[PDB]
Write a protein that binds this ligand. Structure first.
Ligand SMILES: *[C@@H]1O[C@H](CO)[C@@H](O[C@@H]2O[C@H](CO)[C@@H](O)[C@H](O)[C@H]2NC(C)=O)[C@H](O)[C@H]1NC(C)=O
Ligand SMILES: *[C@@H]1O[C@H](CO)[C@@H](O)[C@H](O)[C@H]1NC(C)=O
Ligand SMILES: *[C@@H]1O[C@H](CO)[C@@H](O)[C@H](O)[C@H]1NC(C)=O
Lengths: 49, 48, 97, 49, 37
C-alpha cells in the first residue's frame, strides 16, 4: 500500500498505487469506476477493506 | 429474471402514512441472485 | 459629469453583481473546452466493434495474434477520436484568435 | 463433466452450473483424447490465467 | 465564472490527467494580467 505496483484482482490487471479507501461501498459492491470508465476502487477478496 | 438468474432487490423504510404509496424517493439494494434457470410466466404471494 | 460617471459605474456593479448574464461569451468557451475534453475522456469507453473497450480485458483473454484483430479496432477508433478533437480544437482556436 | 457414464440427447441437452471452485483447464487442454477444443471469446492457453 | 480545476497542484480533471489529457498553465499569472491591466 501507498507504493507503485502492477496490480491484479480477479484478472482485473493493471498498474497503480493501492491505498485504503474511505468510499462507503454498500456491501454488495466490489468495484468503483471513474468517469473515464476505468476502475478507481476495488474490494479485496481476502480482506474486505 | 435475467438469462436464468432470478434476482431480488429490496428496501425496508420507516414511514408515517394512512393513505397511498409514499410519494418520495429511494433505491432498492440487491439482496440475492439465484441461478434458477426456470421459466416464470406468473406469480402469487403467501399470507399467514 | 463626475457624479454621472460614478453613478454609471455603480450601475455596472449592480448589473454584474445582482445577476449573472453578460459573461456567457467567456463562459461558453470554458464550457466548450471542458465539454470537448470530457467527450474525449468518454470516447475511451467506446468499443469500436471490439469485444471490450478495455485493453487488459482483451490482453488477459486473447493471445498475441487474436488480440490484434481487436486491438487495431480500438487503435483505429482512438486515433480518429484524437484527430476529431484536434480538428475541433484547431478550428475553435481560430475563433479565439 | 467429461467423466459421466452417460450423456444427454441434443433435443433435451443437459446444463450443469459451475461455481465456487478452482479451474485447472490444462487438464482438459493437455488431454490428447479431445478431437477439438476450440475457444471463441478467449484463447485456450489463457484459461488457467 | 465557475471552472472545474485549472492545473492548480494535483473530478473531471483527475480523470483527464489519468488519461494524459494535461492542462498547462498560462505564461502570465492572473496577477501579471491584473498588473498590465
Ligand atoms: C508534493 O507532495 C508532497 C507530499 O509528499 C506535498 O507536501 C505536503 O504538503 C502539505 C501542504 O503544505 C503538508 O500538509 C504535508 O505535510 C506535506 N507532506 C510532505 C511529506 O511534504 C507537497 O505539497 C506537494 N507539492 C505539490 C506542488 O503538489
Ligand atoms: C482467506 O484466507 C484467510 C486465511 O488464510 C481468511 O482470513 C479469509 O477469511 C479468507 N477469505 C475469505 C473471503 O474468507
Ligand atoms: C414459458 O412458457 C410459456 C407457456 O408455454 C410460454 O408462453 C412462454 O413463451 C415461455 N417463455 C420462455 C422464455 O420460454
Amino acid at each position: 500500500k501507498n507504493k507503485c505496483v502492477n496490480f491484479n484482482f480477479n484478472g482485473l490487471t493493471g498498474t497503480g498505487v493501492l491505498t485504503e479507501s474511505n468510499k462507503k461501498f454498500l456491501p454488495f459492491q466490489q468495484f468503483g469506476r471513474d468517469i473515464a470508465d476505468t476502475t478507481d476502487a476495488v474490494r479485496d477478496p481476502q480482506t474486505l477493506e | 429474471n435475467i438469462d436464468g438468474y432470478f434476482k431480488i432487490y429490496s428496501k425496508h423504510t420507516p414511514i408515517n402514512l394512512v393513505r397511498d404509496l409514499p410519494q418520495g424517493f429511494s433505491a432498492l439494494e440487491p439482496l440475492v441472485d439465484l441461478p434458477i434457470g426456470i421459466n416464470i410466466t406468473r406469480f402469487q404471494t403467501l399470507l399467514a | 459629469i463626475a457624479n454621472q460617471f460614478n453613478s454609471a459605474i455603480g450601475k455596472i456593479q449592480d448589473s454584474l453583481s445582482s445577476t449573472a448574464s453578460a459573461l456567457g461569451k467567456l463562459q461558453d468557451v470554458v464550457n466548450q473546452n471542458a465539454q470537448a475534453l470530457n467527450t474525449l475522456v468518454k470516447q475511451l469507453s467506446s468499443n469500436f466493434g471490439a469485444i471490450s473497450s478495455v485493453l487488459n480485458d482483451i490482453l488477459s483473454r486473447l493471445d498475441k495474434v487474436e488480440a490484434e484483430v481487436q486491438i487495431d479496432r480500438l487503435i483505429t477508433g482512438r486515433l480518429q477520436s484524437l484527430q476529431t478533437y484536434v480538428t475541433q480544437q484547431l478550428i475553435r482556436a481560430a475563433e479565439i484568435r | 463433466v467429461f467423466n459421466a457414464t452417460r450423456f444427454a440427447s441434443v433435443y433435451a441437452w443437459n446444463r450443469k452450473r459451475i461455481s465456487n471452485c478452482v479451474a485447472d483447464y490444462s487438464v482438459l487442454y493437455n488431454s490428447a483424447s479431445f478431437s477439438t477444443f476450440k475457444c471463441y471469446g478467449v484463447s485456450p492457453t489463457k484459461l488457467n490465467d | 465564472v465557475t471552472l472545474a480545476d485549472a492545473g492548480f497542484i494535483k473530478d473531471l480533471i483527475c480523470a483527464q490527467k489519468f488519461n494524459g489529457l494535461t492542462v498547462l498553465p498560462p505564461l502570465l499569472t492572473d496577477e501579471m494580467i491584473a498588473q498590465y491591466t
